[PDB]
Symmetry: C2
Subunit: 137 residues, 2 copies
Amino acid sequence: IPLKGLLSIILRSHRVFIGRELGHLNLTDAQVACLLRIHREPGIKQDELATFFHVDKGTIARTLRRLEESGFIEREQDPENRRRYILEVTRRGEEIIPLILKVEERWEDLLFRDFTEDERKLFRKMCRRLAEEAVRM
Amino acid sequence: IPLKGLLSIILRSHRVFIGRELGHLNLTDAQVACLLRIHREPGIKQDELATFFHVDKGTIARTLRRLEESGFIEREQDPENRRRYILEVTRRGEEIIPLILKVEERWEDLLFRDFTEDERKLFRKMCRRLAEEAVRM
């Protein structure tokens, strides 16, 4: 199994966990990712968010529509370009972030149950280093 | 940044790399994942592949349509259920797998450039352990 395959197995568990724990909010992994990204960059253009994730436009469009329907984000026309849209997290969206982060913590604790704390720390440090390389790549 | 966020940054580099290196084949990360999964399980039902990835039906449908249009997979009606479809990789699809695996190897080598071999081995071992937990979860 290629490294990416292992990472994908891990991420699939995250997807299932998010869907189960936050399903009452009609949230999915894809929506949470978009919500957190907009949260850290208020006013980001939809096309900029699409470029950031490097996924197909159709997928991002449907994901954002669901977040908007649920009232977690707002979308407005870019005053400088009628072909662009500005995204921002609503008050409702900002208020569910703690819940999201708590679910992330719970998922991590479950995933690392058979890891000593030193191993978990080393894994995290290595991931940070690989993420740094990934950004450069 | 939550662990999943770090893993996602890493996976985003993989997505961009796959798109660039295999773009001449109109392949994307999502299509490669589906192709490899069907490759290892000939005859898998489309709904079973959808369940395996735990992603929305619409996304999987579009991903599989692209693979079919490119002639890498074939889809046929399940003789036991008119609501199900059987997937299989075509000869053309099986022949591009080596190219895909070579690209995976190149991506990994680039990602691990600043890692000693012992660190890369330890990272892989930890990922396998986490993937095993992910399956149990």
